[PDB]
Amino acid sequence: PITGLVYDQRMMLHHNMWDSHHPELPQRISRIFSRHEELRLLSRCHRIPARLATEEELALCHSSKHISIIKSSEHMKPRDLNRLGDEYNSIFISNESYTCALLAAGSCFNSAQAILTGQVRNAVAIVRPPGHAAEKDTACGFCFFNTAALTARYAQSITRESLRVLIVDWDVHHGNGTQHIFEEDDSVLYISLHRYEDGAFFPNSEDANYDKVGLGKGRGYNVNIPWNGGKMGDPEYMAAFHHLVMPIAREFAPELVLVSAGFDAARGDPLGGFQVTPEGYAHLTHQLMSLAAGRVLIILEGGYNLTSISESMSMCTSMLLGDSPPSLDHLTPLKTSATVSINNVLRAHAPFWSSLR
Ligand SMILES: *Nc1ccc2c(C)cc(=O)oc2c1
Ligand SMILES: [K+]
Ligand SMILES: [K+]
Numbered sequence: 042p043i044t045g046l047v048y049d050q051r052m053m054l055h056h057n058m059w060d061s062h063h064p065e066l067p068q069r070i071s072r073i074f075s076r077h078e079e080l081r082l083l084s085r086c087h088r089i090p091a092r093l094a095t096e097e098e099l100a101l102c103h104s105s106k107h108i109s110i111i112k113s114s115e116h117m118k119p120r121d122l123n124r125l126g127d128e129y130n131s132i133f134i135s136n137e138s139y140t141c142a143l144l145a146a147g148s149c150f151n152s153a154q155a156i157l158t159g160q161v162r163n164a165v166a167i168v169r170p171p172g173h174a175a176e177k178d179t180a181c182g183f184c185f186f187n188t189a190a191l192t193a194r195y196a197q198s199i200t201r202e203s204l205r206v207l208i209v210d211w212d213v214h215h216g217n218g219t220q221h222i223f224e225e226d227d228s229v230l231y232i233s234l235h236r237y238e239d240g241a242f243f244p245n246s247e248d249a250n251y252d253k254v255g256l257g258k259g260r261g262y263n264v265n266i267p268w269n270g271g272k273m274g275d276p277e278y279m280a281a282f283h284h285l286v287m288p289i290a291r292e293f294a295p296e297l298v299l300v301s302a303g304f305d306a307a308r309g310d311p312l313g314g315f316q317v318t319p320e321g322y323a324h325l326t327h328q329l330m331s332l333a334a335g336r337v338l339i340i341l342e343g344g345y346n347l348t349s350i351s352e353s354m355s356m357c358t359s360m361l362l363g364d365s366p367p368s369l370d371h372l373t374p375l376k377t378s379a380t381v382s383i384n385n386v387l388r389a390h391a392p393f394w395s396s397l398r
């Protein structure tokens with residue numbers, strides 16, 4: 042087995058011209074890459090080149106209007122960049138933003154290709170800006186184009202349309218964009234774990250609740266696991282994987298796993314408020330490696346404590362490389378509301394999955 046890694050410092054050029062301290066910082070990716078060097082993980086990986094996604098590739102998931110509007114920002118004056126950015130929910134834009142989003146996407150396409158052609162078994166993508174909040178027709182939540190969603194469709198474009206792709210989204214935020222793009226689609230199983238707080242947590246929509254199970258032929262293929270009323274950590278995420286994520290995923294039998302890997306559920310994250318440990322992420326990564334004959338691609342999404350995300354994503358890469366997984370405490374009692382959450386999701390999805398019955 043070989044593990045691929047893609048990283049390009051050019052993606053640091055996307056920046057906030059009006060608030061240089063905005064948490065979606067350029068140094069998120071450079072700090073993660075540096076940690077891979079410090080831990081001697083980088084040389085253990087096969088380096089995969091970044092590339093620009095093409096406009097035709099963006100059209101796999103996004104409208105021509107949305108593509109054209111974001112493209113138009115590459116040469117805008119500051120005043121217009123500011124005005125355009127303010128038209129979205131939680132977006133900043135610089136002249137380099139469009140190109141960086143193209144690079145984030147193209148890097149993941151190259152990574153998916155390396156996996157599917159057999160050049161590597163699995164891979165990690167240290168990319169920014171993030172993607173999972175980006176919708177077909179709009180930008181949102183620091184995201185312009187939906188990198189993971191696009192990567193699923195790209196993967197299908199070089200194998201077959203119905204290639205089974207599992208997207209596991211453990212960013213602490215709901216991937217509203219990914220849900221919507223695949224809501225009526227039974228070829229892409231979307232499973233998100235996220236803080237919800239009955240709608241008080243970003244992005245503040247009931248679309249993130251457990252009863253949104255998908256639409257039409259996609260009924261059953263959208264699994265929301267929403268957290269309420271508690272500081273969740275390793276026990277809760279481990280239980281969700283044991284009762285929900287893994288039984289459903291095994292029954293789906295994916296041919297490729299994409300992880301929307303935000304590390305903002307990590308201990309120390311200022312936006313997330315949760316306490317998943319780097320061993321917790323390691324455990325989750327090792328679990329997903331049991332699927333799809335190990336074909337797993339880990340795509341950076343959110344995560345804003347620089348030391349936390351650096352250590353957390355490095356531990357995931359360590360697992361992909363075959364290092365020994367952590368033994369954690371599966372007997373620690375869950376926060377009471379987490380049990381309620383897991384039970385609500387189980388009730389919602391039992392009609393669609395025999396493994397839950
Ligand atoms: N959405 C959002 C934007 C900016 C933030 C800062 C600067 C700090 C923080 O703790 O949370 C934020 C959340
Ligand atoms: K999520
Ligand atoms: K789906």
Ligand SMILES: [Zn+2]
Pocket residue numbers: 212213214303305342343344
């Ligand atoms: Zn997030």
